[PDB]
Ligand binder design. Structure first.
Ligand SMILES: CC(C)CCN(C[C@@H](O)[C@@H]1Cc2ccc(cc2)OCCCC(=O)N[C@@H](CC(N)=O)C(=O)N1)S(=O)(=O)c1ccccc1
Lengths: 99, 99
């Protein structure tokens, strides 16, 4: 599909058996999901942006479906105000920026 | 052009008569630039990011050339980790997400 940017590019994703709304974010290196109780081992880490840093839990090899497209990779879970799909997973569904 | 996301989508922009590097950020509502001197009046504003809110200077109707494409719009100047081109200007140059 082709998504215009008049509105935030929010799409439905499926992770850990649950459906959620997330932002297709070309400015995010990593994928950051709102606090959820995913099973599996994780490592702590801190990511930063405007406003500072937040602590998150890094989960590897998590399957994620983005608008019907399958992807699998690292997902960071923490107190983010919005679910963010980053470049690490955008590259897997063949997403590009065009202008 | 068509930009893939294996690398950060950084491009050269021209603002205030000077060249800078900035990230095409579909996950950003606004365009935020590292502190610099821009001509014109500005108004204090607060914007939020992943880690919280920061104070920025708001400049309106500023001409910005992004990879040869012109845009004229609001530019926020403040302590951001990286220069970002948000949806407010990306829509002006007709940028879309495709996959
Ligand atoms: C500097 C840049 C390196 C930031 C990379 N990041 C992506 C970026 O798209 C972020 C993502 C985002 C964060 C919060 C949020 C919405 C989206 O809710 C607030 C809505 C207001 C808004 O849109 N805020 C923009 C800035 C602005 N006001 O225009 C913003 O901060 N957007 S990040 O900090 O979230 C990250 C860092 C590390 C790994 C993944 C994501």
């Amino acid at each position: 599909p082709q998504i215009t940017l008049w509105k935030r590019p929010l799409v439905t994703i499926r992770i850990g058996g649950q459906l959620k709304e997330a932002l297709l974010d070309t400015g995010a290196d990593d994928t950051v999901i709102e606090e959820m109780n995913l099973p599996g081992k994780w490592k702590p880490k801190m990511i930063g942006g405007i406003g500072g840093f937040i602590k998150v839990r890094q989960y590897d090899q998590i399957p994620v479906e983005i608008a019907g497209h399958k992807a699998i990779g690292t997902v960071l879970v923490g107190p983010t105000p919005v679910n963010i799909i980053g470049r690490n997973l955008l590259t897997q569904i063949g997403a590009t920026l065009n202008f």
